Design a protein around this ligand. Structure first.
Ligand SMILES: O=C(CO)[C@@H](O)[C@H](O)[C@H](O)CO
Ligand SMILES: O=C(CO)[C@@H](O)[C@H](O)[C@H](O)CO
Ligand SMILES: O=C(CO)[C@@H](O)[C@H](O)[C@H](O)CO
Ligand SMILES: O=C(CO)[C@@H](O)[C@H](O)[C@H](O)CO
Ligand SMILES: [Mn+2]
Ligand SMILES: [Mn+2]
Ligand SMILES: [Mn+2]
Ligand SMILES: [Mn+2]
Lengths: 289, 289, 289, 289
């Protein structure tokens, strides 16, 4: 079981480049650094070479998250959008492989952030989503990549909200490299039980995100970490545990994650790194590995 | 300390009339039935008189909720909207008084649902909301009505997300009949601690909403009820404790509250009542009253 | 899944007869009333049939708890004592069957109270305990009785302190009608996790005791009832859930259970019954049944 | 706020010399090492000075725990025992002062381990304990030592089992250098709420002991660490937080603490050290320091 952090924790814009963070994160002690995959597409093969090398040199693994856009996704009833989504995913999957990344996670079956101004079609999105993910599974698999379908709360997704729904969705896809993904922030809202949600995912759990109920780093809040660690161990989980804290207001990140107030205690960068380091030590000790 | 339930618990649409629930809810054992304040505005004086007498004859109190619309919100940058908002409230409070209602709660400082498609101005909406609520406090006061400002999670309000922020707002208002209102559903997401949140509201807590993290009736989930009851008693809360369960998909209520899966276990009305009745017994036993 | 209560909740002495309690408890709404075997050996075959009749008439099931004495225990190093123990057990079991009782629980593998003034022989006591219980299993099974071995905290027993140890012991016994028994008060001290302890017992869980960490009626405290309820349902527990609260000081019970302060809140019999009725409602709602 | 550990963690006898641990514990990162006042009165003035200098050179603070014997306690009915007890405390206090220890804690009001072999007199022992502590308070105060009265579970003490009882005791003593002492292991059994208990102790909280419900190092279990940390902060606790784990079977320690099974995971010293070190980082991060 390896631990990582989403570099966006230190930024305010989703577009900020992660290159510099590879070494920073490694020095903080993390086994993994999770990055935003759409960025991977704007880099030349040489720049990607730098990155892959920077990671191996600093002894750290990269993992990526993907938030499909409304115009390029797999669940849309609009066939052109679905085609754009398929074309976009295959390209990204290819570039992700250049960085030796083997896990892609996020709302891959849909798009994020979701737009509720217009009515929503859950059954239809569910059905198209399954076809869509099934359609790119082999491609990802050939690049040795797992596609992890993240379960989100009602405000961020209307198709998969509980581990049970995520598991059903993964079984319909019927691919060995497609897995369920849970996030404590989301479970805290939707799940009847943390331990049960994790046990429900079981062998299908392929990626894991952590944070307190208001997205502070692990260890700051009332989350049932002890129960969480026990259940992760019950299902012999050896995948990644990525903390995804969002404690700074402002920018596209602040409005997209809806961080309306500062939750870092007005922390400077040194304090940010400290909380991360402490959260890491906390997660290793309470969760495992 | 008195217990009540939001009648829309039994409905799929906001447009369902509450009149018939007066006796139903009273016979289930509740002390209060909470009702939507917009519905009151659609009744004739005679129907209102009928309703007022029905509540009286059934030994049950009426409490009300208000969700200002984008067209009537006291915090809008557009002075015209603010004026409409003021007119809307005065009108509503008058009608609310015809039913002998002394408690109005909800996001009175803003609008709901909210639209995050346009940038948000927190400091601006905050300042405007304070003046706007201050501006209608006396009017409401002359009617014997307390205005309880509800603290909501980040996905439903961008100004007041915490008990601390709620207290600060009520203070800047500086009115005796303007209070803070907390809701376990919202607290569960935003607060560092349930107990500290309730203690932080203290003498200012004027209204209270309950439900599990996914909105089922109190007692079905992992909410820290023991801790919540101890804190409510610790601040000597003698206000209302209103369970606000939303376990049914479909309808306007389903889409607005984002109930994308059935959380009632396929409950018929009889099951619905039993759950409400058991949650009621639970709440009296664990929370007080 | 059925609910009961240990009648001594109302007494101060172990030597209090439970006959009158059959109707009182049935009328309070419990499906079961747990009684003390100590007494059962005293009543005549005639008085016994009267009790059996009273329970059938009030439609209530009886369950029994046994606290073997140090002069009559199956784990004794002394062979004379082990023989008295087996004789004491067959005799008791014969009488228990006259009351139509099918479940006996307690520290059947040892003796209670217990005496730590002398050195302890853990391995020896565990070993004889297995042989001893194995020695009487069939006799009990012929009578349709399950022997539930209760796991207790370190202050009350030195052999079986966890569900894992309880299960290990039940397996070394190798009898179908010998089961493991858990008690929330004891789990609260020794277990790493309530849910895991219950899952560890799984199919072997034959009887269950409930109470808050300090022995008040369930629902009065911080016990993880929601968690306990999920685990019980996960393992399809359909056995009995007996609350065993001890909130009164004085008498032998006060001394043996170490109730050094009142925890009833100066409750008179009527209050004691209200608390019992509420804890029952609570247990049925949160735990199931 | 400072952190420490009871050296007995690595031992099996209350009579193991602690001098060598001064350096080890300091190297592990602790601010404090808690010592047993067992030996102390047998060390020569020279030895004590060596120990004191060792603490200085290693920059660590010393604290002491005491367990009065049945023959030298202050609550005894026999006037001779109370006299020997007072003589014992003055002697111990003087030598503790030579090691520059300013905090003494334990069941100072009575004796440990308690013996329930014979009947118990709670009111009497209470009254005598109050006078006995009041009686040695000034002697301790001249040395600049605070006497912290430990609240223990029912199995270990019959007089003070609650934070409220301990606070009532300390008030009757009416001495500025006699405070209340809480221990999470003991609180886990007797208290209604961890936070309320800590809040109740308030400004009288002088010392604090930590461990999981079954006595493992802090962070290994389900203790409500977050709630506990918020409470200590609520009361501005700047005292010491001493983890007191007992995870090894065997010896006098093993039988007095009733450790009937290994809870260290068969840990060799290096692992014992890693666990302590990890519980330390954990405690500093969750509780503060
Ligand atoms: O949990 C979250 C935000 O709610 C992220 O994991 C997000 O889903 C990803 O960055 C894009 O899908
Ligand atoms: O908690 C909620 C729903 O999120 C309600 O109390 C709502 O805010 C009110 O009905 C309008 O303001
Ligand atoms: O839990 C308890 C008391 O600690 C009882 O169930 C007891 O064990 C039984 O009455 C005799 O074995
Ligand atoms: O809590 C404990 C063990 O139960 C210790 O602090 C003990 O009380 C002390 O060593 C003597 O009083
Ligand atoms: Mn996530
Ligand atoms: Mn609400
Ligand atoms: Mn029991
Ligand atoms: Mn202690």
């Amino acid at each position: 079981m390896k631990h990582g952090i989403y570099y966006s924790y230190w930024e305010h814009e989703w577009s900020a480049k992660f290159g510099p963070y590879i070494e920073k994160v490694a020095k903080l002690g993390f086994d993994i650094i999770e990055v935003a995959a759409h960025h991977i597409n704007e880099y030349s093969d040489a720049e990607l070479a730098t990155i892959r090398k920077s990671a191996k040199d600093n002894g750290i693994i990269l993992t990526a998250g993907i938030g499909p856009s409304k115009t390029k996704n797999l669940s849309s009833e609009d066939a052109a959008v679905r085609a754009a989504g398929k074309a976009f995913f295959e390209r990204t999957l290819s570039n992700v492989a250049k960085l030796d990344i083997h896990t892609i996670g996020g709302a891959l079956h849909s798009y994020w952030p979701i737009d509720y101004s217009q009515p929503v079609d859950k059954a239809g999105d569910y059905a198209r989503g399954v076809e869509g993910i099934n359609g790119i599974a082999d491609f990802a698999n050939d690049l040795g990549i797992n596609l992890c379908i993240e379960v989100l709360n009602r405000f961020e997704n209307h198709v998969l909200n509980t581990a049970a729904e995520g598991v059903a969705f993964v079984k319909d896809v019927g691919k060995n490299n497609v897995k369920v993904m849970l996030d404590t922030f989301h479970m805290n809202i939707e799940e009847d039980s943390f331990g049960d949600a994790i046990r429900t995912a079981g062998p299908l759990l392929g990626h894991f995100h952590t944070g307190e109920s208001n997205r502070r780093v692990p260890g700051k809040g009332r989350m049932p970490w002890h129960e969480i660690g026990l259940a992760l161990r019950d299902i012999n989980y050896t995948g990644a545990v990525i903390m995804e804290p969002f404690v700074k207001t402002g920018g596209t990140i602040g409005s997209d994650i809806k961080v309306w107030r500062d939750l870092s205690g007005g922390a400077d960068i040194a304090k940010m790194d400290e909380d991360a380091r402490n959260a890491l030590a906390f997660s290793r000790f309470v969760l495992g590995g």
